[PDB]
Amino acid sequence: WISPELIEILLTILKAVVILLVVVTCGAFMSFGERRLLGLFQNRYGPNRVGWGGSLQLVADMIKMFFKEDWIPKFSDRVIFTLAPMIAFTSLLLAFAIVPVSPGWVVADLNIGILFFLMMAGLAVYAVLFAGWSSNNKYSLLGAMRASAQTLSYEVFLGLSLMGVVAQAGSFNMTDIVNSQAHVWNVIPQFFGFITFAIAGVAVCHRHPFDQPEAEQELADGYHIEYSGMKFGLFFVGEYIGIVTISALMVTLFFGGWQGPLLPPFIWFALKTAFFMMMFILIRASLPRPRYDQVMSFGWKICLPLTLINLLVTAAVILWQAQ
Amino acid sequence: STEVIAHHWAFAIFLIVAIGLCCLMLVGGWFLGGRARARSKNVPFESGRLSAKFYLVAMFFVIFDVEALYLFAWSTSIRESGWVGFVEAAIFIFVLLAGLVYLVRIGALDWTP
Amino acid sequence: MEFAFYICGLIAILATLRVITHTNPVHALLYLIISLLAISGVFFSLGAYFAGALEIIVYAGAIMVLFVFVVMMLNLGGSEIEQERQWLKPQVWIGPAILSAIMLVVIVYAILGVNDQGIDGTPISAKAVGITLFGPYVLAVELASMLLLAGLVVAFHVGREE
Amino acid sequence: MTITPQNLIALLPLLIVGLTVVVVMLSIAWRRNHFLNATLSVIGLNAALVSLWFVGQAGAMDVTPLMRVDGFAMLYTGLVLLASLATCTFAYPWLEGYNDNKDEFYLLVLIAALGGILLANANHLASLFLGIELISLPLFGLVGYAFRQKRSLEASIKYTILSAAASSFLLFGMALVYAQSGDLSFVALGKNLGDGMLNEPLLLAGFGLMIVGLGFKLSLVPFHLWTPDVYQGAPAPVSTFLATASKIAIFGVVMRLFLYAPVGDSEAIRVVLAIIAFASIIFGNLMALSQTNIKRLLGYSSISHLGYLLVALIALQTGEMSMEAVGVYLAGYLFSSLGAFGVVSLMSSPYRSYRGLFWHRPILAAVMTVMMLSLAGIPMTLGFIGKFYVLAVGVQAHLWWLVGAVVVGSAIGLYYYLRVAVSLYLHAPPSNWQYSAGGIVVLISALLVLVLGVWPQPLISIVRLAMPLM
Amino acid sequence: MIPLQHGLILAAILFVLGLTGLVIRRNLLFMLIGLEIMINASALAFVVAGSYWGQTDGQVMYILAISLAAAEASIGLALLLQLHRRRQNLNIDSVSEMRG
Amino acid sequence: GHPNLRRIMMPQTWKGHPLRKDYPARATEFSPFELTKAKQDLEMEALTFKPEEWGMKRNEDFMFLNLGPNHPSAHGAFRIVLQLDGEEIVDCVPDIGYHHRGAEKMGERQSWHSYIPYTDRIEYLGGCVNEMPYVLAVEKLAGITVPDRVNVIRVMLSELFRINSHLLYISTFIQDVGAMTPVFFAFTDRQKIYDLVEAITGFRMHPAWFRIGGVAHDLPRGWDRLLREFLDWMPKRLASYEKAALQNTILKGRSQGVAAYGAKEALEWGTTGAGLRATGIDFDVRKARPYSGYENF
Numbered sequence A: 001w002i003s004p005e006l007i008e009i010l011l012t013i014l015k016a017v018v019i020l021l022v023v024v025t026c027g028a029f030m031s032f033g034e035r036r037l038l039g040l041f042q043n044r045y046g047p048n049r050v051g052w053g054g055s056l057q058l059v060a061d062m063i064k065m066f067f068k069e070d071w072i073p074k075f076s077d078r079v080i081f082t083l084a085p086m087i088a089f090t091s092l093l094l095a096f097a098i099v100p101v102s103p104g105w106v107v108a109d110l111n112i113g114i115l116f117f118l119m120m121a122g123l124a125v126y127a128v129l130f131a132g133w134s135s136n137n138k139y140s141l142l143g144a145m146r147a148s149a150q151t152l153s154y155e156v157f158l159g160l161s162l163m164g165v166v167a168q169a170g171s172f173n174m175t176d177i178v179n180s181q182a183h184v185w186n187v188i189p190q191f192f193g194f195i196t197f198a199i200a201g202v203a204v205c206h207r208h209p210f211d212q213p214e215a216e217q218e219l220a221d222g223y224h225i226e227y228s229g230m231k232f233g234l235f236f237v238g239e240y241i242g243i244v245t246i247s248a249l250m251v252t253l254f255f256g257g258w259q260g261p262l263l264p265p266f267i268w269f270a271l272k273t274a275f276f277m278m279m280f281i282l283i284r285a286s287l288p289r290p291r292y293d294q295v296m297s298f299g300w301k302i303c304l305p306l307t308l309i310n311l312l313v314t315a316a317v318i319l320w321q322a323q
Numbered sequence B: 001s002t003e004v005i006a007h008h009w010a011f012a013i014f015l016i017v018a019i020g021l022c023c024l025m026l027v028g029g030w031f032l033g034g035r036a037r038a039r040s041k042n043v044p045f046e047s048g049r050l051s052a053k054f055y056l057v058a059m060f061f062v063i064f065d066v067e068a069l070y071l072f073a074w075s076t077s078i079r080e081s082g083w084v085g086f087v088e089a090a091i092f093i094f095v096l097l098a099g100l101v102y103l104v105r106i107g108a109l110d111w112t113p
Numbered sequence C: 001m002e003f004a005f006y007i008c009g010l011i012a013i014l015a016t017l018r019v020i021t022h023t024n025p026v027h028a029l030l031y032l033i034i035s036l037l038a039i040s041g042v043f044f045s046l047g048a049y050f051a052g053a054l055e056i057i058v059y060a061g062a063i064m065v066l067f068v069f070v071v072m073m074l075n076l077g078g079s080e081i082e083q084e085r086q087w088l089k090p091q092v093w094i095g096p097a098i099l100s101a102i103m104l105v106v107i108v109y110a111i112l113g114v115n116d117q118g119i120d121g122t123p124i125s126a127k128a129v130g131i132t133l134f135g136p137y138v139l140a141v142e143l144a145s146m147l148l149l150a151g152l153v154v155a156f157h158v159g160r161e162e
Numbered sequence D: 001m002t003i004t005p006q007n008l009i010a011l012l013p014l015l016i017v018g019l020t021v022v023v024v025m026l027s028i029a030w031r032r033n034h035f036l037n038a039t040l041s042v043i044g045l046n047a048a049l050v051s052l053w054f055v056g057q058a059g060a061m062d063v064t065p066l067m068r069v070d071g072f073a074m075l076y077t078g079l080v081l082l083a084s085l086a087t088c089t090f091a092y093p094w095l096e097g098y099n100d101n102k103d104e105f106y107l108l109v110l111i112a113a114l115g116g117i118l119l120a121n122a123n124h125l126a127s128l129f130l131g132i133e134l135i136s137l138p139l140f141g142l143v144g145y146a147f148r149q150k151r152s153l154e155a156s157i158k159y160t161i162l163s164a165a166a167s168s169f170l171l172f173g174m175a176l177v178y179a180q181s182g183d184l185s186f187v188a189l190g191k192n193l194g195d196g197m198l199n200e201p202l203l204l205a206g207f208g209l210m211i212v213g214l215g216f217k218l219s220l221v222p223f224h225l226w227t228p229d230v231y232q233g234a235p236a237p238v239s240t241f242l243a244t245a246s247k248i249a250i251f252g253v254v255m256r257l258f259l260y261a262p263v264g265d266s267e268a269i270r271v272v273l274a275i276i277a278f279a280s281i282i283f284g285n286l287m288a289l290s291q292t293n294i295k296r297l298l299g300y301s302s303i304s305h306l307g308y309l310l311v312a313l314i315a316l317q318t319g320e321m322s323m324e325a326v327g328v329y330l331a332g333y334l335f336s337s338l339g340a341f342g343v344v345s346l347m348s349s350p351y352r353s354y355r356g357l358f359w360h361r362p363i364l365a366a367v368m369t370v371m372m373l374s375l376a377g378i379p380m381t382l383g384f385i386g387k388f389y390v391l392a393v394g395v396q397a398h399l400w401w402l403v404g405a406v407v408v409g410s411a412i413g414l415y416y417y418l419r420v421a422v423s424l425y426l427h428a429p430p431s432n433w434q435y436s437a438g439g440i441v442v443l444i445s446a447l448l449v450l451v452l453g454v455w456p457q458p459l460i461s462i463v464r465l466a467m468p469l470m
Numbered sequence E: 001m002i003p004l005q006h007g008l009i010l011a012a013i014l015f016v017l018g019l020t021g022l023v024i025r026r027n028l029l030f031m032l033i034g035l036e037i038m039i040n041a042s043a044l045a046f047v048v049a050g051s052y053w054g055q056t057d058g059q060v061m062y063i064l065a066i067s068l069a070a071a072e073a074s075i076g077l078a079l080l081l082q083l084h085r086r087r088q089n090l091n092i093d094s095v096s097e098m099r100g
Numbered sequence F: 001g002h003p004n005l006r007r008i009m010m011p012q013t014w015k016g017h018p019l020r021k022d023y024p025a026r027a028t029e030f031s032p033f034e035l036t037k038a039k040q041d042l043e044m045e046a047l048t049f050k051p052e053e054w055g056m057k058r059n060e061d062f063m064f065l066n067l068g069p070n071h072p073s074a075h076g077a078f079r080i081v082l083q084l085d086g087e088e089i090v091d092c093v094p095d096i097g098y099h100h101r102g103a104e105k106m107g108e109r110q111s112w113h114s115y116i117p118y119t120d121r122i123e124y125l126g127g128c129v130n131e132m133p134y135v136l137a138v139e140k141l142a143g144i145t146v147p148d149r150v151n152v153i154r155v156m157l158s159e160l161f162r163i164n165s166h167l168l169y170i171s172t173f174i175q176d177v178g179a180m181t182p183v184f185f186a187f188t189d190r191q192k193i194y195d196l197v198e199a200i201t202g203f204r205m206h207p208a209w210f211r212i213g214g215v216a217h218d219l220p221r222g223w224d225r226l227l228r229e230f231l232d233w234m235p236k237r238l239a240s241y242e243k244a245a246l247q248n249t250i251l252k253g254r255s256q257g258v259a260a261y262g263a264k265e266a267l268e269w270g271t272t273g274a275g276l277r278a279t280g281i282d283f284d285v286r287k288a289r290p291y292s293g294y295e296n297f
């Protein structure tokens, strides 16, 4: 069984498994870091008693959520109820599955890349839709309808925001997109693409200020209200893993990915990614929540023509520079 | 080649292990923990007809997503298409923005009455 | 490559059979989404990478989202649907099934009587599809934009609430 | 193949109608004005009709790997544009009584006219498919424009579901055809076959599914059951447009497809279309015997006239004047159907019994009886010239069963057409310039029918000038 | 190495299954679902045909097919919405007022 | 002639009228609260909403929405039933009485001195502000004119508790808009106020420190120091609150033009305070009908 081909196969599989486990661990530890960084932002400490510095708080929450009674309503449809958190986790995990963290460290060097990310987001909206329908609660039903129409209103231009970087790199591949940022990062030319992708990625991740269950707690119309135990935990863990995925895609698409002058490439990638996770915390802790009609009006009247104009101007620059 | 099939194996292992991870998470959550009964436990939590604007928003998402797929196909082949394809895509985006402006002005994209 | 194609084709066939014989609209739409994922796997097996990407982005990500949206707003509790089960009643379904059966045998006779050198599975990237789309197929692009505009206007005019 | 400025000047009606669509849409976005948007739509359609002159002076050439422009394309573009102009003219007094938004009607008419022009210019399977869909979907909107009404909503649902089924059938047919041949151009459909092996089963099955879709679109038996319901339930200007423009554009693209393809001269396809044409003529004439509704009667009339059209279709490869017969018949049928459905529209306008029509509306009664004599193929009318052309083409190719079917269906059509035309003059128990414009449109249609039935030579010369490429 | 005939057979099977679902179901939603199945099967057949010949024309025809499918689904669901709004049922046999 | 004369404090299945003199006040007079299955079902049936009984006067689209009665906010627990056309509120009627404590019946049940803790919990964000009119009215009954030091002490504590209540209100409004950090900082400022109030009275939210004729104790030695720390602490924090959340355009879009009324609607409905004075009507009790030596400030 000793052969270089089988050795390369096993090392590549081990690299993929290591990447997957590190992403899941980072998402959970980033739920904990959400709590700690909110404490830092709000002149307090947050959880710092369970273990050293609160580092064992995640393990305590994990034990609680595993040994909490997992319950499915009698009026609910079992398969859809059991399927919605699976979608909310798996869709954004497999969306991460194309992100290159280092030269030679990638799981799938696909020819579609961010197209595959668009496939996973379009599948990810089904988690909210299925959580709303499955619970057999009308309040959760209209909450899921509102959140799903919001995510459609921002998914309508998520890909078009990415298309400026796609046009500049000339390919759908992620590694070619990173390699096109070897001289200048894409945040400078595709700045409008950068802000529109930030807004759309925050909105499709159901993060503040686009979170629906935290928007209206008086109505009790959230689509999470009938989930408990490890299903609600899967909803939360998939939300934070989606935050990690969106931040890493933002780093690879607008901030050069792993490219840097002095540090090793994974150190630069982790630093830029963690900076964008901290910016997620700061966005949650800083901005007020707009109204529903205001949010979808900002999605439709403003951001989509901005993405179209950005793509048109990017194309004009590209063909102008190609003599 | 060996590298491409190793990449395919790594991707397959990634998808399989992720799906098995969330499946085992469900198995552990359902199997572990005691269960107890209450009278109003099975009743849905309700703190103790939908409009057609949802359909309109989803419909607009579908239509503009198909035109987005057209621009997806354009964007990866911008340099080989040249200035002629730029003119065609400018006409395409002009029609797209005219339809968007028409939707805006007649209140189709206005959620509030 | 061929094994994935045959498995995905079998999954798509079984899922479509489950859609056309179901009473729950949401279950039927979920099985339809599963069949669309399987047909996307078929597309990826044949080297049409862009076609599978569009199947999950657009067909399984926009159109079925619209169908699921509509089924949500209808609140279909199976009123005179689950209480009838008339499609499962045999003398209703024997006729059209044998109609589609003889049509399928005729189409299979047509298919088996053609030259087949096999599909080599060479991947066709989205760059070549985009070059062709804005090259020899430009009027198709602009008039398809006009077709989407026509559908937009038609379904806005029909599907208002007032 | 790239696009040249000469290819742009060949694109003139398509570009003009598309620019009209954009301009009318932006004007609706500015301010909802029914008169100004209708005027803009009529101005754009008339501009395309005028620019057909520049297209003719441009010459006949190939603009795309998809489109081909020749005199055949000009003739069918002119027919579609005239039908759309008459549809707008009939639609304005009907839309004067519509409580909801009226401005989307002309947008849908313009997009359907765009699809008709594309079908006229189509030399490809992609252009054929896109033109069929670009005609169909605005007709989905227009048939159910008065969606509050029971009949209009029912007709819209029926037309939408059945045309989606026909679109899937047609698309699977060209999928099989492309799987066999490898090129989607019209000239290469069977070019890779020789030595008498043209009847390949996969190509024949793909063309059969295409025949299923197109025979839905042409109201051909046995895909004809939608025609009386969709004709009756739709608004009368929509019935006018669906009777004239859609049928003419789809039959023109079927003409071009069966001329250019090597598989078009297959024996099995010819026998299948002969059966379809025979059954279409006989069934459409027989099912209109006991119709008291004018719209269903004219739908069955459309089925019969399309059967005569298919009889003229079958002798394409043998006879030499089959295209000339189709053009003359289609000009006459456009004029007759425009007049008949226009008088029906003017009696159905504004949006809120043909017996005894002469005693309050004598001019419209005279126009109606002229068109019901025209659809019967009575001499001194252009429908007679079309029927004479169809019979001559059938006699040349020895299509004797089709000739007998035409004669028998002509007798049955004579029965019911004369029944209506003489029920006009029995005894039974407006005030705007657009209604007068519709009356002028139907009056010039009747005068054209009478003049070209007495003197058909200018129309024959015009149609003979519209010769497609060899 | 995948035969073209097997892909065409799969597309034909999905096409006739969609037609069966279109015919045997009274509910307008299930007929729209069946129509979507038929047009997606035709798009699959066109993709297989384009992939055998090594041409992008199959994927271009697939793109046109899904554009038609999206717009037709939009129009059909709008008609279904109005039918449910004014009729309170989805029985397609109930709308049969026009006959003969 | 009342449009609907139903009970507003007690449930509809209640026998007798509580504020009559022959009605027993205390719960120990009644049987102790037993919750059986039939009792739980019967009381859950009574809390269900029926469109016809509340005078809704109902179109095949008017859906009904339930807000409470459990309420995720600091200001009590209550219900609102909403008639909706799409998202538009066509009609609504508030359901109150879920927080009924019988404080007036306790006024008939406690003595003049012992009722002051119950006067504290009338508006539990007000404290000494709630104690002030009761002790003023009792001093009117007793013929007591309090000295000037008493008036200044009561004004000082009333303004301290007014700043506490307004801080909680602004923080809760900003949190309900969607910014969750000023509630943390405003409760820190509330802790500073609470330090001073604990030093003076010995309690945080319900001091019960005002008395008939004065206050319970003298001011402790060092009250001026804590008041100095609060007066130095407050204005920079308030300016940070404005700049961070109150001048945010998202908050302005959520707030400006929302539920607006004029002087006539404020006058006809008895609205007072900031809602009345935002209509331009200069009517404050401290300046129109001065009390407790508020004319010297």
Ligand SMILES: CCCCCCCCCCCCCCCCCC(=O)OC[C@H](COP(=O)(O)OCCN)OC(=O)CCCCCCCCCCCCCCCCC
Pocket: A086, A087, A090, A091, A109, A110, A111, A112, A116, A123, A126, B004, B008, B011, B012, B015, B016, B019, C033, C034, C037, C044, C049, C123
């Ligand atoms: C509850 C479970 C629901 C279903 C979950 C999924 C079921 C299947 C799980 C097992 C999958 C095993 C692995 C499949 C093959 C992976 C590798 C692959 O697709 O390789 C082909 C191709 C290679 O690309 P490349 O190398 O760049 O091409 C040049 C030529 N070699 O690469 C590609 O073509 C890449 C594009 C295809 C990738 C597909 C990934 C999965 C898609 C489905 C996601 C489902 C999400 C959850 C459910 C949503 C709701 C139903």
Ligand SMILES: CCCCCCCCCCCCCCCCCC(=O)OC[C@H](COP(=O)(O)OCCN)OC(=O)CCCCCCCCCCCCCCCCC
Pocket: B001, B004, B005, B008, B012, C001, C003, C004, C007, C008, C011, C034, C037, C038, C040, C041, C042, C044, C045, C046, C047, C121
């Ligand atoms: C195991 C038994 C069945 C168990 C239950 C069902 C599980 C899911 C089965 C379907 C999905 C996995 C199929 C197996 C794929 C394994 C990888 C493979 O075959 O790769 C071959 C090929 C790689 O690309 P290529 O370049 O063509 O390779 C030539 C060599 N250089 O690959 C390709 O070209 C494309 C590979 C397929 C496309 C990507 C994956 C699509 C996934 C679709 C899921 C659909 C929903 C499934 C729901 C299941 C539950 C009901």
Ligand SMILES: CCCCCCCCCCCCCCCCCC(=O)OC[C@H](COP(=O)(O)OCCN)OC(=O)CCCCCCCCCCCCCCCCC
Pocket: A197, A198, A199, A201, A202, A209, A246, A247, A250, A276, A279, A280, A283, A290, A291, A294, A295, A298, F248, F249, F250, F252, F253, F254, F256, F257
């Ligand atoms: C990894 C990716 C993510 C990384 C994290 C960092 C990026 C996060 C981006 C978050 C974006 C949130 C966008 C929220 C938009 C809200 C728009 C809206 O609806 O505003 C409504 C408001 C008033 O609306 P109006 O119609 O005027 O109402 C009048 C009624 N009296 O209108 C207004 O107030 C007008 C202004 C609207 C907002 C404009 C856009 C602001 C975006 C947030 C600031 C971002 C700054 C850069 C941060 C660093 C990024 C690295």
Ligand SMILES: CCCCCCCCCCCCCCCCCCCC
Pocket: A018, A019, A022, A023, A026, A101, A102, A105, A244, A264, A265, A266, A267, A269, A270, A273, A274
């Ligand atoms: C938020 C960041 C998530 C990262 C997930 C993937 C982690 C992969 C770790 C790879 C480590 C080795 C990288 C190559 C060697 C160069 C760097 C060496 C020092 C770390």
Ligand SMILES: CCCCCCCCCCCCCCCCCCCC
Pocket: C095, C096, C098, C099, E093
């Ligand atoms: C209330 C209206 C119900 C309409 C149901 C229609 C069902 C049609 C069933 C057709 C069955 C055909 C069986 C085979 C016929 C012979 C083979 C095909 C023709 C040669």
